[PDB]
Structure formats: structure tokens, C-alpha cells
Amino acid sequence: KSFDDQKKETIQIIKNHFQCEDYEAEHYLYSNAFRKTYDISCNKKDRRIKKSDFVESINKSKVLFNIWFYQYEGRKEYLRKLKESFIRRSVNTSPYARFFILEFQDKTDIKTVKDCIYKIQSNWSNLSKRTDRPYSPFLLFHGTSDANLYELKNQLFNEDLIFTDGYPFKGSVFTPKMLIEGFSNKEIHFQFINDIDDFNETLNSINIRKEVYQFYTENCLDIPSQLPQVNIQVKDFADIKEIV
């Protein structure tokens, strides 16, 4: 019944409320519920509590950051709790159209973003010469200027990491077919989706199962709701690498 002892008792309360599974009760639902509890207590103006809008606000299809949950067990414990929950992997990863929407801000260095791309591409692709169904992850970045976005694009291309954005030449219109044909191309490491408008055009061109792994810090993109999504909020961009 203490701060470090009671907290397990809320899980079965959330579990029978939504008739939900165990892994999204403790990690997705209760962690979001505790965060909005702080937001009505951290402010010193309105400490009164409502219930009608509180129940549906936490089911926003996002795993918001919890600063106390990050604190009393450390960085390594908190990032692996997100590793087994929404990044459930297998030895036989299927060729699905995986989308990685990452919030790239102007305060983020290029090298830290390149380390995350090099881990996403290595873990979510199988570009073997022997496979008949190769796959490559789709990479989308937002929240950055175009000039800073092209610097990451150019440095990635120098270290032999071949990608397509649907723009095979200068002055080209967006060609979604090059993104799909690079998914089955073993010499194309990943796909660099340029922006939101090019992102939403890409989903209409694929017929196979699609997954979305959004990792952000402040703002989140309103992805269409029918496909599976993973929305995880972190502190910095370096936390994303140890989650993918």
C-alpha cells in the first residue's frame, strides 16, 4: 500500500474495465492513465477531477511517456519494458510493409539519427541473395526543415545505404511504384518516405499486410486507424534505437 508496493493492484482494475490483454494493460493503458493523473496534479489551478472525459482520453492509441516510470528503475529497465510489448519479434519475421515514423527535430544530431536508421534497416529487412520475398522497412521523418532533412539523406547515401523516396530523378513527381518495387529489391536497403502526403499515397499502393511503428517525442501523426500502429513517446531520439 506504498508508492513502491501498491501499484500492481491497478492492473486488474484496468484489465476488466476494457476486457483487454495483460501486455497493453500495464504498459499502454495504466502508464497513460498515470500520466494524465499527474497532469491534473502538476498544475496548481484545477486539481478537481472529472471522470466522463478521463476514461476515453487515455485510449488514444499512443503510449505516452511516463517520467516517474522512467526514473525509479532506470533507462535500461524502462526501454526493454517497451521492447517486449509492442516490438514483439520472432525468428521468422514475415515480409510486411513496415513503416517507421520518427520525429526528427532540429536539435537532433545526424549521427544519432543515422544510428537509429542503421538499426531499423538491419533488424527489419532481409535482403539476402537467396530469398524469394525480400523486405525493406519504410522510413518517414517529420518535424524537421527540408534542408536538415536532405543532409541526413545525403550522408546516408555516402555510406552505401541505398534508398528510394519515389523521386528517381530531379524534378520528378512522387512515384509510389518505386517504393513498392524497392520493397522487393534486394539492392535497396530501405525506403525514405519524404513527407506526410507522400506517406498517405504509399498505403494505397500496397496490398500486403502493413505495420506502422511511430516513435515520437512531442507531436504525433494521425495515421489511418485500420492498419496496426505502434505509437511510442520517448525523451530523445537515442531512446528509439534501443526499442526498434
Binding site: 526493454r80 517486449e84 516490438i87 525468428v91 521468422n92 538491419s122 533488424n123 529487412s125 532481409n126 537467396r130
Partner: protein, 567 residues
């Protein structure tokens, strides 16, 4: 990239991995060995861990080099936790790299919790990976430590007992509850454990009356001269003598049988059988004898007075056993008067009792020690199986009376005993010869029923091929040093527990110190490197080329001859 390997074929219990690019060239030397581990996955999260079995690096003049590693899946790692199981599928192609350090540690550390880990060795191909065994299951189940001579098998045995002796929990500075009995025939562990109780023939005193019916017959009966009269009189001479010397509670005096462990005077037993050689009889077929008290018949009420030599028989005709036991009497005096059997048939066995004998065997006397080394080098070989079976049955029955007292008392103050049988094929041979049958069934009793009474065994042998399969299979945990004889290798391979594909083919190729443990106590059958002994077992071997190179020894010949004649 350092290595570019890939699964190109999948079998139900085999993987075929082709290394396409090899650039660093130390991955092949260190991380692509036969006993090495590989992770098979498209990601770093969940990997199918596999051990290598074979490889064939073919090169050609114009063709590309093909490496073709053949491996077998041993289990499944997931989020740092390793699940065993060979029935896990990795659909080819899958990226293959050598297993990282944290995954190899997760093979062994995760299966056994902290309070149950017993570490005495580290992995041979990765010295940073400690290999703990389930220390409860390591010793509660029986151990077989084999490996050819010169491979350091006795190094492996003593290192295990040294770690078990130093297995002290925090709270005390005294000795722990380790109880190790070593049947040391090569006299190696005297210098391995200096704080122990080493017992040679000049120090050990084993009572002859603690032998059961099988061991008493084996010491004194002639198998070729299998006389029913010699067999049966030996029971009546001993069982009646055990009744007389009993002076405690009279309720168990008449319950004494031949196998009951009470004291009898064997000098009186010889005098009884020698008197039965002097058997006379009358018209009524009744043997009449004369002593200082007077004339008496031969019945159970006068059977006790033939135990002294001052008996003069009275009669006319030939008795039932007149002269048929003189083969027995002269064989009995060749044993009790044998100076090499002074430790089992001398005057020391007359005065010692049951309690001091058992205090000597598990070092529970005045000088308590965790390890009791029984130096059986001086024991004659024709009585060596008897002496082993006497101690083996006494310790096992001590463990029986330990448990069933505590079964009806519900106390956790327990005495678990390990018996190290070095050169175990001597004691429990494959052959069904009758001379070693006493020690074969005593070890088999400990091998089968012994783990429930807290008496478990450790079979150490450089040549396992004469160890009987009824006893060697009871050793759930099996440790193998370098084994160079194919007869020993094929005996091991067919007696083996549930292993992995080609780990037992490394037995002839083991270097110095490398071992191989399987069984329920370890997570994975693996080639480890045993921790080097800071106090190794060294036997005092007489150095012939050192002594033969010396000048002709002239003084030390008459000292040998005059000591032979007791002068």
C-alpha cells in the same frame, strides 16, 4: 562486415550455414569452432541459437570459397532469456553471426538460479562464459567423471570437491556440511586436500564382523571348493558367536542372523570349525566332547563351548565332518594371520566398535573434516572389492537410518554423502565374475536407491568400458575428459543422456583441461574448460629412470631381508 553467414538448408535437427564473406579472419579461428555457438535470426531481438557440428572450407582456383558450416539448433533466446528446444524452425535464408557474449551467458545463467549455481568451470571456446551447473542436481544425482590417463581427470574430480568444500554460505567460519568419501587407489588426493583425513592400511581399521553374509563368505570361502558343509558351518560358527558377545538388550540377541552386524571372535570361529574337524560320534550319532567342566553333547545349549581350543572330543566312530573342514581351517588361518589383512583381521578390529568405525569413515571423530580419503593402495587386490563393499554398504545404510529417523521426526538437519569411486571399473566391473560381485552390488545399491537416502556416488575412471551399464547409466550427470579409446568412446556414446548433434565426437580431440558435462544439472551439453587446480592431485610415483641411473645400492638389501623375517 566481419562475417557474412547464412542458413541455406534446414533439417529437423540440423542447420547448414554458408559463410559468404569472411573478412576479420579471427571469427573463424575463435568463434567458428566445432563447439562454438551461433545465433540464427533476421533481428537482434529473438534468435534461434545453434551449436556447430561440422564444416568444410573448400577452395578452388576459379570458384568462390565455400565454407558450409553444419550446425544444429539447441534452443531459442528471446529478450535475453534462453528457451531450450530443438523443434524450433528458422525458415531459410536467415542471417547467421557468432552468438554474442550476453546470449551465451543466458544459456547457462538463466536456467539455474543464483542460490543453486555451482561454478567449477568456464566455457572452453569462450573463457568469459562461466558454466554453472544446478548444484543441488549436480550431487543429488550421480556423477560419472571419465577421461583417459594424462588428460587431467583427477584434476577435474578434486576441483569439484574443492569447490564443494568451499561452498560455505555467509554466517560462519567453521567447516560446512560437505561429506566426501574418496576411494583413492593411486594415492593422488593426499596432496590435493591437505585439510582432510587420509586413511591407509596402517591407519584404517575395518571390522571383519561388520561384513554381511556375502562379504564374509567372499573373504573366507573358496569358490572352486564350493562345499555346502564348509558354507553352512561358517554360518553357524559366526551367528552363534555373535549371540554370545552381545551383552546389551536380550530382546535382539536371538534375532541375530548371519548378515546381522554384531561382533564375533573369529579366533573362536576358527576354533569352532577346527573342533568340528575333530568330530567324534557314538551309536546315537551324537557328538560328545570333554572340557574342564565335564562331558557334554553337541546341541545348541552346548554349541557355545566349542569356541575355545581346550576341548577334547570323546567318541568311537567317525563324525559327520571328521576331516572335511580341514581345507576350511587352513584357509581361515591363512587370512587372519596374514599381515596384509591386519587392518581387517587384526587385534585392532577386535577393540574398535560400530560408532568409531563410522566416525572414521565420514570423518566424524575427533578431527572433523569434509573429505575422508580412503587410501586403498595398500589393500590387497583380492580383498579390495570386499573393503570397498564394506564401506559402501555401511555408508549407504547410514544414509538409510539417517532418513527414516528424520522421516518420523521432520527435521532438516541432514547429512548428505558423496562417495568418489576413483578407478570405478575395478570395483564395479562389466564382467559378472563372482570375486567383484560384492562391490558391484554395493555400488549398484548406491547407484539405484542411494539418492533418496542421501548417499550418492561419483564414478571416476580412465577406462569406462568395464563400468557396468546398470551402474554407469544411473549417473545422470556425466563429465568426460579426453577419451582416446574408441571402445571407451562407443561405450560412452550409447550410454549418453539426451545430447546435441555432434558434441560427443570431440572426445578424442580434447586438449588439456577441457571437459564435457551433460545431464539434468547443466542447461546444455557443452565443452568447458575446468578451473585449474591450485593444489593439484600428485601421486608419489616411484621414478625408475631416476633411481636406476644411480649407483648400485648395496646397503639397502639386508635391511629388506631381515625385516622380512621380523627382526
Amino acid at each position: 562486415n566481419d562475417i557474412n553467414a547464412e542458413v541455406v538448408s534446414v533439417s529437423p535437427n540440423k542447420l547448414k550455414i554458408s559463410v559468404d564473406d569472411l573478412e576479420e579472419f579471427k571469427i573463424a579461428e575463435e568463434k567458428l569452432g566445432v563447439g562454438s555457438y551461433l545465433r540464427v535470426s533476421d533481428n537482434q531481438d529473438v534468435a534461434l541459437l545453434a551449436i556447430i557440428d561440422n564444416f568444410s572450407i573448400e577452395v578452388k582456383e576459379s570458384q568462390k570459397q565455400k565454407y558450409m558450416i553444419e550446425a544444429s539448433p539447441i534452443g531459442l533466446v528471446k529478450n535475453g532469456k534462453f528457451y531450450r528446444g530443438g523443434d524450433s524452425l528458422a525458415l531459410p535464408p536467415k542471417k547467421v553471426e557468432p552468438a554474442k557474449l550476453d546470449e551465451i551467458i543466458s544459456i547457462y545463467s538463466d536456467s539455474i538460479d543464483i542460490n543453486d549455481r555451482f561454478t567449477f568451470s568456464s566455457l572452453s571456446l569462450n573463457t568469459k562464459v562461466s558454466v554453472p551447473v544446478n548444484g543441488n542436481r549436480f550431487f543429488n544425482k550421480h556423477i560419472a567423471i571419465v577421461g583417459s590417463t594424462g588428460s587431467g581427470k583427477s584434476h577435474t574430480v578434486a576441483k569439484i570437491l574443492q569447490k564443494a568444500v568451499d561452498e560455505k554460505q555467509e554466517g560462519y567460519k567453521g567447516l560446512n556440511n560437505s561429506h566426501i568419501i574418496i576411494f583413492d587407489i593411486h594415492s593422488e588426493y593426499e596432496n590435493a586436500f591437505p585439510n582432510s583425513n587420509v586413511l591407509n592400511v596402517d591407519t584404517l581399521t575395518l571390522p571383519y564382523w561388520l561384513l554381511n553374509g556375502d562379504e564374509l563368505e567372499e573373504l573366507f570361502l573358496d569358490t572352486e571348493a564350493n562345499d555346502h558343509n564348509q558354507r553352512n558351518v561358517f554360518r553357524q560358527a559366526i551367528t552363534l558367536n555373535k549371540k554370545i558377545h552381545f551383552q546389551g538388550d536380550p530382546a535382539t540377541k536371538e534375532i541375530i542372523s548371519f548378515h546381522s552386524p554384531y561382533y564375533f571372535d573369529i579366533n573362536e570361529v576358527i576354533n569352532y570349525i577346527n573342533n568340528r574337524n575333530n568330530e567324534r560320534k557314538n551309536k546315537d550319532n551324537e557328538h560328545i566332547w570333554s572340557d574342564e567342566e565335564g562331558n557334554f553333547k553337541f546341541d545348541n545349549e552346548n554349541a557355545h563351548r566349542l569356541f575355545k581350543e581346550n576341548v577334547t572330543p570323546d567318541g568311537s566312530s567317525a563324525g559327520a565332518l571328521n576331516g572335511k573342514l580341514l581345507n576350511f581351517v587352513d584357509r581361515l588361518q591363512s587370512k587372519i594371520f596374514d599381515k596384509r589383512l591386519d587392518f581387517i583381521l587384526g587385534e585392532g578390529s577386535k577393540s574398535v566398535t560400530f560408532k568409531e568405525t563410522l566416525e572414521t569413515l565420514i570423518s566424524y571423530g575427533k578431527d572433523k573434516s569434509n573429505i575422508t580419503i580412503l587410501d586403498v593402495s595398500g589393500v590387497p587386490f583380492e580383498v579390495l572389492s570386499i573393503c570397498v563393499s564394506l564401506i559402501s554398504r555401511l555408508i549407504f545404510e547410514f544414509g538409510y537410518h539417517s532418513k527414516k529417523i528424520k522421516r518420523k521426526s521432520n527435521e532438516n538437519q541432514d547429512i548428505p554423502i558423496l562417495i568418489v569411486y576413483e578407478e570405478a571399473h575395478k570395483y564395479a566391473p562389466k564382467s559378472d565374475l563372482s570375486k567383484y560381485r560384492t562391490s558391484k552390488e554395493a555400488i549398484e545399491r548406491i547407484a539405484k536407491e542411494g539418492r533418496k537416502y542421501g548417499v550418492t556416488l561419483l564414478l571416476a575412471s580412465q577406462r569406462p568400458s568395464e563400468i557396468s551399464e546398470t551402474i554407469f547409466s544411473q549417473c545422470n550427470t556425466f563429465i568426460s575428459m579426453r577419451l582416446t579409446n574408441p571402445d571407451d568412446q562407443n561405450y560412452v556414446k550409447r550410454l549418453l543422456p539426451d545430447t546435441v548433434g555432434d558434441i560427443t565426437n570431440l572426445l578424442p580431440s580434447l586438449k588439456e583441461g577441457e571437459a564435457l558435462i551433460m545431464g539434468d544439472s547443466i542447461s546444455i551439453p557443452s565443452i568447458v574448460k575446468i578451473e585449474k587446480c591450485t593444489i593439484p592431485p600428485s601421486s608419489i610415483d616411484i621414478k625408475y629412470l631416476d633411481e636406476w641411473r644411480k649407483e648400485w645400492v648395496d646397503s639397502e638389501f639386508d635391511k629388506i631381508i631381515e625385516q622380512w623375517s621380523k627382526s
